[PDB]
């Protein structure tokens, strides 16, 4: 029973982070832990992703208490550098979020991802 | 009511208790009106174990008086009739009813 | 003389009032700090010196 329990396996990892890159190219993503919690307690968040190998794990483990209280799915991913390459940014981002927007052309893939990870959790 | 039912069930003991001459009609009506008031107090709305205790005391003392008038008037101990076990049967009924209606007092138990 | 003086008996009840409100706020702080170990007695005793 570790502290990063809903850790996604390989194929679900690849589909959630190509949805990440589509969102980053569609200007619908928030990069980083404190902007993630700011958009989370603002409310606009379809789902949030953390990285399960940051060198202190608690600096993004503070996000569960917000997200499963405000009823939004959350998923750990086994590589911060892969999530950085997904977000399309130089330094490794460890906590990304997808904002909510019904004027974005990845709504179908976002909802498929969200249904898969609610079944995962 | 049911107080009428209990009082009417205790009539044959006074019936043979006057049929044998050890209790005449005046004093048996006296003990019957006293038992009437005691039994309505027992089957009131919100009675008490003190009322159960003193009604039991009345029945034990009328049993002692019945045995005394039996050994004085008829000069026999056991009258082999309904008049002997009836008061102890009633005391058993009163103790069973008290332990049903008030089960938390170990003094009465 | 200065043994039948009044400028100390003014500040004596000034001290009594300040000490009264200080004892009240210390009662509140001790009641909640011990209540974090034991909440069920701040409602059952009220006399703070007995507390």
């Amino acid at each position: 029973n570790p502290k990063a329990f809903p850790l996604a396996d390989a194929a679900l990892t690849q589909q959630i982070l190509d949805v990440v890159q589509q969102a980053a190219n569609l200007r619908q993503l928030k990069k980083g832990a404190n902007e993630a919690t700011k958009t989370l307690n603002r409310g606009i968040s379809e789902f949030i992703i953390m990285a399960a190998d940051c060198e202190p794990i608690e600096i993004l483990l503070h996000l569960p208490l917000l997200c499963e209280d405000k009823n939004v799915p959350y998923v750990f991913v086994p590589s911060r550098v892969a999530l950085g390459r997904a977000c399309g940014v130089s330094r490794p981002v460890i906590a990304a979020s997808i904002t909510t927007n019904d004027a974005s052309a990845i709504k179908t893939q976002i909802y498929a991802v969200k249904d898969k990870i609610e079944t995962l959790l | 009511s049911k107080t009428r039912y209990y009082l009417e069930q205790c009539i044959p003991e006074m019936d043979d208790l006057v049929e044998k001459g050890l209790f005449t009609k005046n004093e048996v009506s006296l003990i019957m009106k006293k038992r009437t008031d005691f039994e309505h107090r027992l089957n009131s709305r919100g009675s008490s174990i003190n009322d159960y205790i003193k009604y039991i005391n009345y029945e034990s003392n009328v049993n002692k008086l019945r045995a005394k008038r039996c050994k004085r008037i008829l000069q026999v101990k056991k009258t082999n009739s309904l008049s002997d076990w009836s008061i102890q049967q009633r005391i058993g009924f009163i103790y069973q009813r008290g332990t049903n209606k008030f089960p938390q007092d170990l003094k009465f138990w | 003389s200065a043994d039948k003086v009044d400028v100390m008996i003014i500040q004596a009840i000034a001290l009594l009032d300040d000490l009264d409100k200080e004892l009240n706020t210390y009662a509140m702080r001790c009641k909640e700090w011990y209540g974090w170990h034991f909440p069920e007695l701040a409602k059952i005793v009220t006399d703070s010196v007995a507390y």
């Binding site: 307690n41 608690e58 | - | 200065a2 974090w36």
Partner: protein
Amino acid sequence: PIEYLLFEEPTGYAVFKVKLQQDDIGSRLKEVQEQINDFGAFTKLIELVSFAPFKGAAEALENANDISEGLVSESLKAILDLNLPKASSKKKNITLAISDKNLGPSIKEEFPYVDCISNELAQDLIRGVRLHGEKLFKGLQSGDLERAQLGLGHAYSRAKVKFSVQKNDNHIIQAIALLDQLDKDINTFAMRVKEWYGWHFPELAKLVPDNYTFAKLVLFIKDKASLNDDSLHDLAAGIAQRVIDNARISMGQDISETDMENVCVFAQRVASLADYRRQLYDYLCEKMHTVAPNLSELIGEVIGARLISHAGSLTNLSKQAASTVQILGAEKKNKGRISRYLANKCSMASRIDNYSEEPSNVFGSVLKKQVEQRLEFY
């Protein structure tokens, strides 16, 4: 066939004999399912025949955990072994109206001659005895149900969460909110010691301005009659000679006695308050080192206690974002970007030492080194 019922209650286990039966076929009718609500007909239907209270608090928690996972325990098995008759195989086996199908097989495993039952008849009979509550038990108890179930609920919740009762930030909250108010109270009462001992020796507020050593030497010199003992004043406090000759040259003086004695009582008690402050500050220093060590090493102990007090709780501070750790006064262009850096590093340390199970100091130290390199960038 419902003739015995088992009810579980946060003071004890109850077992009820079912005197007569409920109407089974018409058990959705209004004139039947109002009889469960009213009291004058429910005691026609259910009487109490056994009530054994578990008396230990921890044994109540253990019975509640064994029921909540659906398993028999010592007190439940004890009262069923007592009350449930051996229905011999010529007649039948006895029936028992219990509340849940998860519990059912675990009493059927242990007692063979019992037979559990929970249809909607057992459901609404248990609902009726739950509704009427205390008025069925006719006084076979000592203690009401709601306070006992409050305690049992809090204990069952903490035993399910396995909540760490060593991560205690409320201690640091009350510690610093007592500490600053206690410094203010020591200062005010020491001003009262000064203003009350002025009538006996008004050239002492000039010489001895420190409140604690003022109160301690007021405890030392009672009346202006010392005049000789110079070798105790450097202990209790050069200026020894100034206060000694000012004990005879000044004579702005009232000669009063009982008020001087109560000044002495007041002064020694204010000195006791100063000793209490000087130990409580050290207490919350080491309790800040124990509870919140990374934030302690990064920002300092009393600044950390002030910051957790401003946040309200350590968990609330952690679930705050890293840009809303703006607090005025604490975390004291080139004078502002260093404070922003220290702010979100303080939020990072807060996240570490709150969401850890019990924290370490190595991340506080490398955070200190990172922010010191960012300061030496200037």
